[PDB]
Design a protein around this ligand. Sequence first.
Ligand SMILES: O=C(O)[C@@H]1CSc2c(C3CC3)c(Cc3cccc4ccccc34)c(CN3CCOCC3)c(=O)n21
Ligand SMILES: [Co+2]
Lengths: 216, 149
Amino acid sequence: AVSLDRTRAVFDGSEKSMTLDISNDNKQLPYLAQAWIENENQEKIITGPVIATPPVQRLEPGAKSMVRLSTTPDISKLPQDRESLFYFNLREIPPRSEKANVLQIALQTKIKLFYRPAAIKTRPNEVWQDQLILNKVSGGYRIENPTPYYVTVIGLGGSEKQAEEGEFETVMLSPRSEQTVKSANYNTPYLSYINDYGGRPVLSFICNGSRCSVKK
Amino acid sequence: AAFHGEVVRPACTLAMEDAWQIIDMGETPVRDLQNGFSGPERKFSLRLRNCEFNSQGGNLFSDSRIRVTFDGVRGETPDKFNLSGQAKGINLQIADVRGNIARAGKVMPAIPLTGNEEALDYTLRIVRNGKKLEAGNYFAVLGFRVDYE
Ligand SMILES: O=C(O)[C@@H]1CSc2c(C3CC3)c(Cc3cccc4ccccc34)c(CN3CCOCC3)c(=O)n21
Ligand SMILES: [Co+2]
């Protein structure tokens, strides 16, 4: 019943708070929504450095509301030269039916919450994902993310259509990290990624031997 | 419009037939259970709306752009969920359209969907938990968790 207005959130470290719209799309019954934050390990947190309020609220049938995220002073302890990862969670509590022999389903939505420090602030539509490097290795590619941002890779194939539609195990590269992915060899690799808006662009790569980079 | 504000993919809203998001399991299937079978099967459909779930080549679930998990209390085996209420000797089992059994807190495997619908389809049934059967009323709240990539 209760839904969130986005599939990932970027918290701009130059501000102290932001809001996410939520909504009860059930037009008949009130639902409660709980909201909390988890750290990069998906262990819960409540005192900081990011908090969600209110942690529970009631939505009348059809109601629209919001959840606010704010930072505490301890936010300054996070690295200022790379993103940090949290998770935002939104879990409905459906109204109790006192019906005999029932199974009741409660949606929980869990999205990535990227804390993006002021020093690495981005402009609308900026692309850093084109800085990825593929390296051919046994059975696939070692993908390098030299950037200060998390990069979620959802496609890798030998054409655009394969990048968007081919079977691929989603993988998220931490800032300034690398990861090996099992893959067929592609002559001109195409790579699909998810951006801050939840769109899925595709990048065209060219290889020199085992090393591949984006077409300038 | 060449020029406009930020537009983002919303997260999916979950829609069911029932306004309470309830599946009626029917009376405790005592006869069926004593003959060593599970209880009769109960179909439930979850529609995931408003997130452009379907795309030209596939859909968010089959492509692993979302990951879904049933959260609840493990019963007798990893393959079973616990039930509340007065009945005794019973667990719940949830299976997907290819018969993969859900385990509490474990992500369902990404599989391609049938009737190319906008819907996730699950099947539940009551099974034994190894304790003695005491018929009675049962209930469970199951978490259905969507993790977005
Ligand atoms: O207990 C129940 O059966 C239900 C399901 S969980 C829950 C909570 C909530 C899970 C704890 C709260 C507490 C709660 C609910 C909505 C907004 C809140 C804002 C701040 C504090 C508490 C709020 C309840 C309190 N109410 C709400 C108004 O009608 C009378 C009973 C409640 O009934 N319930
Ligand atoms: Co536009």
